[PDB]
Amino acid sequence: LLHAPATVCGPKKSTNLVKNKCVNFNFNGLTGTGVLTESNKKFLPFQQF
């Protein structure tokens, strides 16, 4: 520990994806609450949120 910042981490589990309902969400470390819908916004191939 405390040397060579974390590079060997345990597996991360996933669940199903729901839309149009109030659901708690955690998108790769981003915690929030709301309703998720498809959008026409276009990001750049390296932008996450």
Partner: protein, 33 residues
Amino acid sequence: FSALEPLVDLPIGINITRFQTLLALAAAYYVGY
């Protein structure tokens, strides 16, 4: 004007203080801080 996009995020913990450069033995390269 042209912006720079990321490529790599190597998680290696070495410390860097001085660097160098290769030449394939018309060359010109600029260095800023």
